[PDB]
């Protein structure tokens, strides 16, 4: 996934019930006060949820497209690894809703978000 490469996002788990991925906080990922740019977490949340959603749909099949990403920012950090896990809230014919929670290396939540996706049909 191109943008994931820029983030340094690396997946550790991926399947129909969820996904997990991680990245190292680096200086290029910060904002002006030297803490993580919120966009990084929004992006992490989007990636992890979308990959889980695709895995589930294809476990008739098809593709997925994001329609809403709603992220709450909890705690400001400046370095170390962050870790996200996606868990399912709704998985149906038309849409899916996934929760992604990002923690730091002290198991404190730094961000948490929900991603709503549309399922798109495949050619039969």
Under a CB-based contact definition with an 8 Å cutoff, are residues 68 and 115 in contact?
A: yes
Under a CB-based contact definition with an 8 Å cutoff, are residues 43 and 102 in contact?
A: no
Nearest distance, CB of residue 48 and a copy of itself, angstroms: 11
Select from 22, 71, 96, 119 the one that contacts a copy of itself (CB under 8 A).
Answer: 71
* Distance between CA atoms of residues 28 and 87, nearest Å: 29
Nearest distance, CB of residue 13 and a copy of itself, angstroms: 18
Give residues after which the chain gaps, C-N over 2.5 angstroms.
Answer: 59
Select from 43, 53, 86, 102 the one that contacts a copy of itself (CB under 8 A).
Answer: 43
31 binding a copy of itself? (CB under 8 A): yes
46 is catalytic: yes
65 binding a copy of itself? (CB under 8 A): yes
Among the listed residues 46, 113, 31, the one whose alpha carbon sits nearest the alpha carbon of residue 73: 113
* Distance between CA atoms of residues 120 and 117, nearest Å: 9
Q: Name the active-site residue from 46, 60, 87, 121.
A: 46
29 binding a copy of itself? (CB under 8 A): yes
* Residues in touch with a copy of itself (CB under 8 A): 1-7, 27-33, 37-40, 42-47, 50, 63, 65-73, 76
Q: List residues with catalytic annotation.
A: 46
């Amino acid at each position: 996934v191109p943008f994931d490469s820029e983030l340094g996002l690396q997946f550790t788990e991926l399947g129909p019930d969820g996904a997990r991925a991680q990245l190292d906080v680096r200086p290029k990922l910060l904002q002006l006060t030297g803490v993580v740019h919120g966009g990084v977490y929004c992006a992490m949340i989007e990636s992890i949820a979308s990959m889980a959603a695709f895995a589930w749909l294809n476990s008739e099949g098809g593709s997925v497209v994001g329609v809403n990403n709603n992220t709450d920012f909890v705690r400001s950090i400046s370095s170390g690894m962050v870790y996200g896990t996606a868990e399912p809230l709704h998985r149906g014919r038309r849409q899916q809703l996934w929760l992604v929670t990002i923690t730091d290396d002290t198991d404190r939540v730094v961000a948490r978000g929900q991603v709503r996706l549309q399922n798109l049909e495949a050619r039969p």
